[PDB]
Structure 1
Amino acid sequence: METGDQRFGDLVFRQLAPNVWQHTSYLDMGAVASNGLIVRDGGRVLVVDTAWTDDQTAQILNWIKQEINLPVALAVVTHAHQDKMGGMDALHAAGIATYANALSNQLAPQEGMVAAQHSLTFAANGWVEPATAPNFGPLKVFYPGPGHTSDNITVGIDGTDIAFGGCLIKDSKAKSLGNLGDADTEHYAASARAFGAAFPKASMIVMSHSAPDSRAAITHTARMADKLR
């Protein structure tokens, strides 16, 4: 927890830009961090990823109400793991519209997760079909291909130098990819590089389990992935 960070309950918030904050929640497994984003877009707020749990995700919503005081219009979640979708019910209880890759929603029940209300689909070039992501404002959603998981998606924030790699991208000092059973080790490297190419001017790379990094996180991640093919 660095200087300039705010704490609300068990959550930590770091402002990254005038209209963007990183939310961080922890699960004791020894407190393992997971990062998401909060975006102020005019008179509304957009959320990328829940916290680990419903209660933690409610803390995010209370912090937003208290510190930003704008309604949360929608949330997009970036794949079907507990750190990204664990608080879906808290969002739904607040009347927030939720979006995920169709595959994430298909996987959610098997994972003991609650599926989002709406499914995103993607063109062959990886960009989201705009009709499935209505009124996403500055959020530009890109499916880079299979990597960390088959369903992982990524998000750039228009008007900023920020892109969110989710759990696909590791920080540039990482000693391993942590890749498990559901990783695609054949395509991981190409998918990391695809994320980089989709958001070629993003200079701040936000990710799920490390603090924000430079684009070196992308190239370092791709190098680690090259070794697995």
Structure 2
Amino acid sequence: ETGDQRFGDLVFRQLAPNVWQHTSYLDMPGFGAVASNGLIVRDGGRVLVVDTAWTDDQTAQILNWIKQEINLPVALAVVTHAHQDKMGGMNALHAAGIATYANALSNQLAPQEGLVAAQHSLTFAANGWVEPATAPNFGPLKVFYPGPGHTSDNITVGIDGTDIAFGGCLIKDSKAKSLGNLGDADTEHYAASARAFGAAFPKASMIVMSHSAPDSRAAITHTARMADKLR
């Protein structure tokens, strides 16, 4: 659509005045060319990234796009679990000198997953909110661990000052026929974790997610319902 700017085999879509969705694609036998989404946030004179693309080369295109279209330094990136669609491009971020952050558990898992760990580890209070001293300079990004679901390590991100909350791999859209790739999922706890995400960001009306276009809060409801069926 008109909002879907094309650049370097990726797609960039403005969602709010200072927020864009990045989308990259990986062709895999049996799956088609699977889209994965992350975010780009301008916070004053700097840019913040949520999630890499599937590959280093694609993630380099995210950074090229930022330079062309925003032309401000990228201060940090936060990646939302140790799977290829979210952390496949860590080397590109590190080649740009960008400080990278992930759940401590994601950093522990990354090497066995064939991924490069983020430089910095986030830890979370018992109620799920990030311990702020582990998320220095996060600006409007509000990071929440909802519990195991799509993976054990999945985290979520709200953008303060906007209507947006990012569910990453945890949340699928209201028309989705399944929960996507459950290979590393916690099927017992998924429904509660999806609901915890919704309760952490109760003001959010635009739910952004890894594998479908932004949706209403019906994405959370429908995801939790599909997840309840797994119990």
SS at match of 1:110: coil
SS at match of 1:179: coil
- Over residues 69-124 of structure 1, what are the superposed CA-to-partner deviations in whole Å (9 max), with x where a residue is unaligned? 00000000000000000000000000000000000000000010000000000000
Cα deviation, residue 3, structure 1: 1.6
User: What percentage of residue pairs aligned between the two structures are identical?
Assistant: 99
CA distance in 2, matches of 1:141, 1:206: 14
Cα deviation, residue 181, structure 1: 3.4
Cα deviation, residue 31, structure 1: 1.3
* Structure 2 counterpart of 1:193: 195
Query: Structure 1 stretches of 5 or more lacking a match?
Result: none
Cα deviation, residue 180, structure 1: 2.4
- Over residues 3-39 of structure 1, what are the superposed CA-to-partner deviations in whole Å (9 max), with x where a residue is unaligned? 2211111110000000000000000112110000000
- Over residues 24-71 of structure 1, what are the superposed CA-to-partner deviations in whole Å (9 max), with x where a residue is unaligned? 000011211000000000000000000000010000000000000000
CA distance in 1, matches of 2:131, 2:177: 35
CA distance in 1, matches of 2:214, 2:156: 15
SS at match of 1:185: coil
CA distance in 2, matches of 1:180, 1:202: 26
CA distance in 2, matches of 1:209, 1:178: 8
Count of aligned pairs: 228
- Over residues 106-148 of structure 1, what are the superposed CA-to-partner deviations in whole Å (9 max), with x where a residue is unaligned? 0000010000000000000000000000010000000000000
Query: Structure 2 stretches of 5 or more lacking a match?
Result: none
CA distance in 2, matches of 1:179, 1:65: 33
CA distance in 2, matches of 1:179, 1:37: 21
CA distance in 2, matches of 1:217, 1:68: 30
Which aligned runs of 4 or more in structure 1 are off by greater than 3 angstroms?
none
CA distance in 2, matches of 1:50, 1:4: 21
CA distance in 1, matches of 2:60, 2:207: 26
CA distance in 2, matches of 1:125, 1:95: 32
- Over residues 176-226 of structure 1, what are the superposed CA-to-partner deviations in whole Å (9 max), with x where a residue is unaligned? 113523211111000000000000000000000000000000000000111
- Does residue 55 in structure 1 map to residue 57 in structure 2? yes
CA distance in 1, matches of 2:83, 2:183: 13
* Structure 2 counterpart of 1:228: 230
